């Protein structure tokens, strides 16, 4: 139940390009679309729901951090857990990845748990 | 980007011959981003700041129009960017690497502005067209009006300089200085008096825009509350 | 339901021009009025109430978001649900459109659910 | 039960000039002073308490909006309910009005309920 | 019981020079050290605890206003209650004064209750 | 029970260089990596968990204070408690130190408890 498990995939040097907020069922949610600051590769979409999944306790710490990184535009590392959301419309629209971690990324090395 | 935009109240018949002129000789990048060298400060910047996002120009026009005592008409001039136009992000990274600090207040400010700085004066052949923004006061709308076209467009079809501003002054440490902003978090160096508004000696009598410190506002949006 | 459900309209490339806050009955509320723009696109007024609607869990997430969209002046996409507010005076002064989603626009397309 | 009744007064074109925060009888409170548009009239002071009167639900949203309008100095409309805060010293010190609403003002028109 | 009470000492034209946060027992505390702008007097320290003393309701509002005043570095008036904290080590390293109020100073006059 | 205790270590003239947020066993956590000015070396990593250790009551107060200290990038003092987190994977990933206090340093003398 940690943002360091083998089941968590992280993408470094991401920059949060687009933000979205809404409500699914009875839970607020926010999705971040991050594009690599290279121009190669598909964007990474990570969503967090206020009252769903095992990542509820960190939702309020990921909403103000992504918004911190979206406004600043700093290069970041996104830790997501795939195949969390099940409502087909939700994955087909936004994503199935769950935003479970955010870290600050520097030029040489980038913070947070690795591997 | 290929085309930048600048909001100026002078009519196109005088801009197409005079253009935009440098305020002074303050080449400091730290002062320009926070506006200390622009109209909110010493008013001697060496850079003319223009935005590439069309919505930012609408923001400037809205801020100046919905102010209740600005008596004037605004014109949005589109300018062909050339090798003298620089994006502030490549130079911020370089200046921060030579022994300087750009806090998240000045990092979140360029992201909101899409600023491009011209080191020299914007020559009249760099402006392609001027759209006369019309302010329907009764409705309260800013809409594109008569879009005149300059006949001096060279049409080389060049691009901006993707490098760093040459001869950047060494950054100053422990600045603790305010960032001047107006309207919907529109930076300084975008206001009317943020350029040389003195043609043939006389000065256009329009409002002096009141600038607020952007640092509390950037913290407010970042922290959410 | 969901922000991207079928019964939700959305307006893209809109800029929040006017912000209003207050209280209705025993619930805080905020309304956003978008720019008139051009053509026949009359300004969209969307209100969200803190303690009376069905979009309660997301009321805060719009509230902090719309405000930062009002302050920054960013072009965004508004997901609103019509005929949610039923008070005649509220519909006359403000609108009956419930603010149910906010998305960041990046010209071309806007992030978030469509259709 | 709304910032639109006949009992609610509103002052448009105002600019929040001064801000004050404190506690009054285990109730946090904030007061805003608008000095603009003085003329022959006095500056307008509006005070909102965290646990007093019927405007408790909208205390937080009003506080955030007042801070936002103070740090930007934007011309705004203040909706106040007169003749509250029956403490004599509190009235003689700050005000007897309750901050019930804040709206954005744009020269021609102002958002929010009128009349 | 009130910020403008007779037991409260107010110091005007005091910019917040240093900020400190921490935990005392089970209460989060924040302390501000303010010095005179024109190099006068002695720089006074005011501390607020999240779960101690009678100033608990205003701890959050005081914390946010103190943070805002520290970011802007504006001349502000502080309202402190002397002799509130009792543990000896806290008085040696910080003040016994409780931060009970904050108001903005606008050139000549300052907002907030006086005398 | 206090950030000024003897068991608490502190490092002055630090600048928060890296930030990380995540979840760990139903507890939201954030870690800050602070580096000595001028680059002497030995970065200090301090983590705070929302629902672990004895430092829950000051978690949020250190979160929004670290973020601000990360935003401004000012010289700050970090008060940490060594050997707080016990999970070996977490210890090797980020740190075992607990973020217990944050102070502002004015390059003359850091404001806070000293030892």
Author numbering:
A (entry chain F), C (entry chain E), D (entry chain D), E (entry chain C), F (entry chain G): 1 to 115
B (entry chain B): 6 to 230
Q: What does the study report here?
A:
Pore radius measurements confirmed that the PltBd1 homopentamer exhibits the smallest pore radius with significant distortion, while the PltBd2 homopentamer displays a larger and straighter pore. Further analysis of PltA’s interactions with distinct B subunits identified a critical hydrophobic interaction between Ile227 of PltA and Ile71 of PltBd2. Additionally, Tyr70 in PltBd1 forms stable polar interactions with Asn230 in PltA, contributing to the narrow, contracted pore structure, a feature absents in the PltBd2 homopentamer. All holotoxins demonstrated cytotoxic activity, but the PltBd2 homopentamer exhibited the highest potency, approximately threefold greater than the PltBd1/PltBd2 heteropentameric toxin (DiaT) and nearly 75-fold greater than the PltBd1 homopentamer. This suggests that PltBd2 homopentamers are likely unable to mediate extracellular secretion. The lower average dissociation constant exhibited by PltBd2 suggests a higher affinity for these glycans than PltBd1. Conversely, PltBd2 features a valine residue at the corresponding position (triangle, 6E and S12), limiting its binding capacity for Neu5Gc-terminated glycans, akin to PltB in typhoid toxin.
The DiaT genomic islet encodes two distinct B subunits, PltBd1 and PltBd2, which exhibit unique functional roles. Through genetic and functional analyses, we demonstrate that the heteropentameric assembly of PltBd1 and PltBd2 is essential for cytotoxicity, with our data suggesting PltBd1 facilitates toxin secretion and PltBd2 mediates host cell targeting. The holotoxin consists of a pentameric B subunit arrangement supporting a single PltA subunit, with the amphipathic C-terminal tail of PltA extending into the central pore formed by the B subunits.
